[PDB]
Amino acid sequence: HMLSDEQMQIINSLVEAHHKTYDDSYSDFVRFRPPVRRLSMLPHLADLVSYSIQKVIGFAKMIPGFRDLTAEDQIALLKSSAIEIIMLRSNQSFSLEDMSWSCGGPDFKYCINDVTKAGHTLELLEPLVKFQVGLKKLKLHEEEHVLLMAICLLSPDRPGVQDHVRIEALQDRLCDVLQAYIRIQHPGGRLLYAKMIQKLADLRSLNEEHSKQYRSLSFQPEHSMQLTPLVLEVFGSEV
């Protein structure tokens, strides 16, 4: 078999959508508040996350058929999934030789001790590194990484989603585009789809832990004041 003219247009669009929303140069990073080596890294990492939340919103709008759900469904899927997409998209900067995200600048290389200086503990960070090293080891193609993000975003089993029936449909349409792609275009990926679905379930566990840890950070005015309006709105409890 092969991919259909319609599934490939999904692939091309998702890929260009990721190309437009993910700057390989990382040059927008100097416009963030600097990184500093309690919670010296919070302003810089809050800035970094707030930026990539904006990118993920841009990615979503270009996912085939996202632009056609209720604006409320769009926001519910974006709020609940943003932190998982960010963890996903970030694999692109995680080098395994360094066990950090090196972002085109030594001021922008984030080791685990950096993220502790932004409020988080190993109960989150160590499962998170293991996720990224497991995901990097899967040596995904670009279309798989990008398909995996769109499938992650289009989960209908998140708090707030209304038209579950339809979100289910479009996510299923991408699961099958992906599954076809791996069968047809990836030599030696006879099990790879299943490895990717497990990575989605990983993401939920870390989302849970981040949420738990974020809530603790965001309930102290000392630290919430260092976040951004976009971060507070998205990772926040307000319905």
Binding site: I57, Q74, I75, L78, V234
Partner: peptide, 9 residues
Amino acid sequence: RHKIXXXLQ
């Protein structure tokens, strides 16, 4: 006050 999330529009 006022959701950033119409950065949908």
